[PDB]
Symmetry: C4
């Protein structure tokens, strides 16, 4: 049993010297790294083109349908008078009706086919208000039924919509919905058959705040299909099958290795009888390899489905493939651990990790207290403290010396208004930055240095 | 006495093993953390809505009443000719008179009710100048009585104000004051009854510099009341009472513990007879808990008052609640100190603190000298050195590697003008940054490393 | 043999004490540093003037020929309607025809002389579309022959171009090509004879995306000649010859030293018989000196050619000269290594380097995995993750605490759209920044500290 | 002699214990710190008011006299057509003639009084061109006499200037000079008598590049006098005299101490007979005090002159006073050196300094080589590499982790143009940042840590 146990923990070189078995798994892992990286690169190259197409079409739509729109004004684009709102709505509808004659792109009208479009209708102009909405600020009185009533005009592609009358005092919002069909000719370069896009365009005039300011936004959804009857005067699926086969073989070999480890662990436990030490028979690198294989196979199946237009879950597929690629690239450290000089550094990090995590536990409570305090106190006055996630991002960036002066200057811009709040912000920011830069990061450095010193002895 | 003293310093686990008393205080502290955090989250969620309402209304007012106003131009918005100033004033008054027909919001006029509005007047247009203002720059002569005279026209909501004549050579400023009543319908979502807002709007055309440039600003004050006769087709006060009860119980238990410590200290002193060592009987964690309880109770009472519309001190309440939440979250380190691995890091920080503070004392004098020098020399030329607090913020950000290049480039933009000042700025910035980054932060790191090394032995 | 070997490794001071030979090479190296630096400074001063001339002319061309152009709008300048595109094209052509009467600069027309300009033609207005381009998005149908057909109108400098008809549905792009001749009178200051510039101006209206948005750009190529028949009412070539002679002498002496080292190494090997230890006879400083001499001589020849207008490879010459200057300035460390106090620090760096490089090897795989994952997942949503090189630059800047908050906020701006992607971005950014700042840089610091500690003992 | 020598090196406490002499110098230094700081604060408060006045007047002038000017466009403000230039010039002159009726400020015209204004002339409109300027880019020919001829029209304050004819092909520049008199009424607040300003306004249309782009700028010079015949319906000079007296007394006492040290050193040398060890008798703190006293006295005299309007050298006075304040605040470290715990840290820094400076010497050559290489190679393409001082500022900010990503992205914006330059920039930036952050700063930290470790033993 001793010999088998010793050989089980032997390094690949020692195993080859002893039994001479060819290291199939190492070569398979190298090939897997290569093919997985190539597949990810190809997928990203293909997807960025579609992303660019959709983004450019959306920018063109914003310039076409939004009155007085200019680049970089998405956040602040709003209406402030009834005349402005009416003009914007009518401009959007008129530009929809004039699209064939003015647009640089080639778009087709989509009629009916569901809701909110009635049969034969291309554009739906809906206004949503309250069922009952009596409001009298002069007498501090109101009577509202929060139930929302929707009223839509239907415009067929080529003017009753010009008779629109908005109930401003009880208006919840206004929306314009339509769809445009186009063909992605940009696919010709990069050697792909053009596909058919349907853009669902929604223009929203939002009055949910009732603050006298109605923001205006335009959004698009892209539905991609294979064009019927294509006409233009295989190395994508074979590569996917190759990747799947490589991952399956790697999974089988790693599962065999893990089973062998489990059986040897059981034998050793039985021998000793006649948990931390049990899991010594577990090869975490092979767990990582199995996880990467599963993720890659799932992502490859999803990618095959997507590229045939049968699926539209690009986010999940991209996440799976990227995570698997990261895992396979991280797995290369196993090979470096077999050399003493590199193993020194890897073991330094490994022995540092536990105390680092314990110190993270110690620091998290202070960090969270600061987050809550900053959100509650500075949230009203600071744009960077409006949400707890935003507060955490701001504090994390401050800890690393980024955007410090702008954070100070935002509060400086309102020193005269509230002196108490300004003094509190001064104390809060100074104390947090000093504590976390001059004491916490220093202790991280000290922990790493101590781990390195221990490893070198 | 020895046994009682030993038990007094026993850890909670040892105390439970010895006497078996249930650790009520620990459970109470956990519950306190939970309820305090939930209360803070709810309060912040509620307050951000009102902040958004006020900010949006103010932006709408700026777009409505300021002629030629655009987003992001608040700091530089100014008039430069008499025609521009007259046009801006008349535009503001005309937009006030046309508000019902043009505004997307629903506003009500407020008449009279104090000063500067006479009875029946909604808008007050005041101009403030000097009593006697003879100025003759041609002869380098002037005769001024600094006493300020105010002259206001009163406009009743629906044109004598069109006859306004400004005394430009002796004008101190022009102001427009009015009030608008609105109802916050946005409260319907989040399940709250709408409240009644009164916005006091002040538009200022400022000529205190007499520099030929008159900045224009708009400011609002919000007074919030409960709307009389509400009509819309309890889990906020019960939670506050629960929080107050929890904090009061924690305060009572901590006071009992502190009294026991005081009595035991007195007994030990008497025994020894028959300050640093005396305060060893003081449990600073319980002082922190008592402080947090007091702050939380005060903030909860203020919050109860505010949410009934009887109080308007949001800043003080928010500061109290945020500070108490920070304190209760920092108090969790006490529980970690009972475990050796975490106590190692906590004790490292504790033993590092004194030398860190002494080095801060050493560094403060150099920092202050640099602050004064930079303010006096670069203040005239650098926007970031205009005020001592701004100088301190800039230097602190520089020490942490933020906004360095913009600071250098601002001076670069005027190298040709004054070569001496540019050379001085070069020497000043380079020396300060080098000294504080390569020697001071390094010494902080060394102090922390030495403390950690001592603790590990 | 022992005495000769000992003298070969003697320091310059010891060699002078022993044999008394004048250290010609040291003085030559000092003179080389001086002359090389002066030459580089003069070359850069001369080149920046031409760079400024070309840049200013290009800005003037953009303001002259692009309709509605404003500074800082190069990236977003685009057309969105057929009317806008026609107006821009006609404005460019009309401004070309009116240049003599409106331009502040003095330009001459260039006619014919190649392609795309026919004989006697100054401006070429080409439109490129597809040979066959049937597109019917209504029926999801298309019939395209990807072959590109070009049709150009020729405009002679002083209106058939006004009859231009664009094939929008199959348009690939539109281009306007012309050339302008000018004289660089700015050369008079700095005491140079004015030279003759020919600017080849290309205006591109790009429709390769077929997205309804056609970006517009202007680019120029400068061809510089010596003006024929100059008339204006030697210390540049003599200095170049001096530099070349100094570099050649340094090369000869260093080659002699390297040959002596090789011969002594051969003698020692023969004696011992009767690789790491062999290369001990190689003086890497002299290899650096020889490389710098070769680079400087090549760059000086290229510079001589350029300044006579016989060459136009400014990038290669600048790279050669800058690299050689960097090498000669780095070579000064050799002289500092002869003093114990400075040699301590230099040897610290030298002994730290190998473990630093090994740790870089360990870290590269994790860095690459993160790069690929971020590119594939965040590329569609983040402007800073569009390309792998851009991803690497962003991650490298993040590791050093730059642009952290903007990176977080770009993803924050789309939290509601995709919650899964936002959560993944949170985990990705937080884990990467924490791992690389609190563990990797700490280990670099620890490696350097250990090297320094070993050197001091 | 031994007793006197021992007493000479005694600490202030030991000296007081031994001889009982009252420590007059310590109290004097404390009073000096207080009074010098108060004086600096008052001077800065007074000066930034005048700075604000001048800046506001200049902004008003830019808005009045520059056609189409908007805030934040100073750098890019330029003309591109002859029509634009004529319109700008005529607008400036017309606005000068209409100033009394349109300006919000009160200004007086200044006539004649030197050059370029003839007797009775308020505005001078000069155009500078070449004596002979034949330019024929068509034939690549030119004949220039670089002598500059100036031709000015004179406009008396209330239209021959409308007949201006510009020689565009040989124009060097156009300038408009005039002067305006105003009274600074803003001085009334802060309790000062208003003073009389004369603004010399120069508007420049610059054509020295001959690039078809003529930048337009406005500059002002302020000359300040005491207004004659002031009329408005001493604690500044007494404080200055107090400061001067305090500094003089401190100087006398420190000189006495230094003379005593010199005499004792001479006695010791004579005794031993019967440089590094000699200068042990020099008290560098007293040298610092003497320098600060001299600087403060000089700055106070200059400030007295300035505040009486007899001097205008604000930069020199501010530099002197700021440097003296920095020195006196740095001098406080002497008192901290008398306490062991603070002396530990101060001595750590003192013993670290020499090796830090030697390592700076080692690093300077690499830094300079990188500076030259970056300037020569990236200068043509990168806005941040245009000048060697700018290159140094950019590299220094990069070393400290500031503005990294923008530096990378500026080069990314031109990857396609020159691939060789882009690759070189990648290698250059990556190598520089890595070398200086992961090896140089680490060695600074290691040096400080070693110094601290040695001091603690
Ligand atoms: C076209 C490519 C075909 C490749 C596969 C066939 C050709 C080929 O070389 O296979 C090598 C593999 C082993 O490949 P591989 O896993 O690399 O080889 C094993 C590992 O080196 C293992 O050590 P660790 O790597 O540290 O765990 C070691 O203990 C085993 O020795 P032992 O056998 O004496 O105990 C080796 O056999 O051996 C098979 O017998 C395949 C059975 C697969 C069953 C999967 C489902 C359970
Ligand atoms: C106008 C300026 C003229 C300058 C040159 C003439 C005037 C002049 O001082 O020359 C000094 C040089 C040597 O100049 P240099 O190289 O500085 O001198 C040698 C180096 O010091 C070398 O040590 P390292 O520097 O550490 O390698 C040392 O071993 C040699 O001793 P050794 O001779 O006893 O072995 C020295 O002769 O000696 C010549 O004989 C020139 C032959 C050149 C052949 C080149 C083609 C192979
Ligand atoms: C209104 C305020 C008036 C203040 C001054 C008068 C009232 C007053 O206390 O003077 C204290 C000073 C000394 O003031 P101060 O300099 O503080 O006192 C001396 C220092 O403590 C010195 O040590 P260091 O400080 O380490 O150098 C020490 O060796 C001397 O002892 P010794 O005398 O036994 O050698 C002290 O006399 O003694 C005078 O006799 C003034 C002579 C000035 C001559 C200047 C021109 C050369
Ligand atoms: C001259 O250079 C160095 C002198 C001393 C120490 C390190 C380096 N550098 C070598 C090059 N290196 C790569 C730059 C391009 C991206 C990939 C980088 N490699 S990396 O290992 O992923 C890595 C990443 C971040 C931090 C450290 C290491 C940077 C470090
Ligand atoms: C050999 C088993 C333990 C090695 C560590 C597990 C993999 C680490 C993942 C980063
Ligand atoms: C146990 C008494 C001393 C513990 C320290 C006091 C509380 C620390 C507050 C951060
Ligand atoms: C003396 C031979 C080895 C010295 C090192 C080689 C030159 C270093 C280049 C930076
Ligand atoms: C006591 C003499 C030496 C003390 C150092 C000199 C003053 C340091 C200036 C920063
Ligand atoms: C020893 C008691 C630990 C308590 C953890 C909250």
């Amino acid at each position: 049993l001793r010999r088998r146990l010793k050989y089980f923990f032997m390094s690949p070189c020692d195993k080859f010297r002893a039994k001479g078995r060819k290291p199939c798994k190492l070569m398979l892992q190298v090939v897997k790294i290569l093919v997985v990286t190539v597949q990810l690169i190809l997928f990203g190259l293909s997807n960025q083109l579609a992303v660019t197409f959709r983004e450019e079409n959306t920018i063109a739509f914003r310039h076409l349908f939004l009155l007085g729109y200019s680049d970089g004004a998405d956040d602040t684009f709003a209406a402030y008078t009834r005349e402005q709102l009416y003009q914007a709505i009518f401009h959007a509808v008129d530009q929809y009706l004039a699209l064939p004659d003015v647009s640089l792109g080639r778009y087709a009208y989509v009629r009916g086919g569901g809701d909110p479009w009635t049969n034969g209708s291309g554009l739906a102009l809906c206004q949503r208000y309250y069922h009952r909405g009596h409001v009298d600020p002069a007498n501090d009185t109101f009577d509202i039924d929060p139930m929302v009533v929707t009223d839509c005009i239907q415009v067929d592609p080529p003017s009753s919509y010009k008779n629109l009358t908005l109930k401003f005092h009880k208006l919840v919002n206004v929306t314009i919905h339509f769809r445009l069909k186009t063909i992605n000719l940009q696919s010709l370069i990069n050697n792909e058959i053009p596909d058919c896009y349907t853009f669902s365009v929604l223009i929203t005039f939002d009055n949910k705040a009732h603050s006298g300011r109605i923001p205006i936004s335009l959004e698009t959804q892209a539905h991609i299909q294979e064009c019927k009857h294509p006409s233009v005067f295989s190395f994508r699926l074979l590569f996917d099958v190759v990747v799947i086969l490589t991952c399956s073989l790697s999974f089988l070999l790693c599962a065999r290795s893990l089973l062998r480890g489990f059986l040897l662990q059981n034998e050793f436990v039985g021998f000793m009888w006649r948990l931390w030490e049990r899991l010594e028979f577990v090869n975490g690198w092979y767990i990582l390899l199995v996880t990467s294989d599963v993720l890659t196979i799932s992502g490859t199946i999803m990618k095959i489905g997507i590229e045939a237009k049968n699926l539209a879950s690009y986010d999940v597929c991209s996440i799976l493939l990227g995570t698997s690629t990261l895992l396979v690239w991280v797995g290369v450290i196993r090979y470096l651990t077999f050399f003493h000089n590199y193993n020194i550094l890897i073991a330094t990090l490994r022995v540092a990790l536990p105390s680092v995590m314990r110190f993270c536990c110690c620091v998290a409570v202070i960090y969270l207290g600061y987050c809550f305090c900053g959100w509650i106190v500075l949230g009203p006055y600071h744009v960077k403290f409006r949400s707890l996630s935003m507060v955490s991002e701001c504090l994390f960036s401050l800890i690393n010396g980024d955007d410090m002066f702008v954070t100070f200057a935002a509060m400086q811009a309102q020193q005269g208004r509230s002196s108490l709040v300004w003094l509190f912000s001064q104390l809060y920011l100074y104390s947090f930055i000093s504590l976390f830069i001059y004491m916490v990061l220093s202790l991280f450095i000290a922990l790493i240095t101590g781990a390195y010193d221990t490893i070198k002895h």
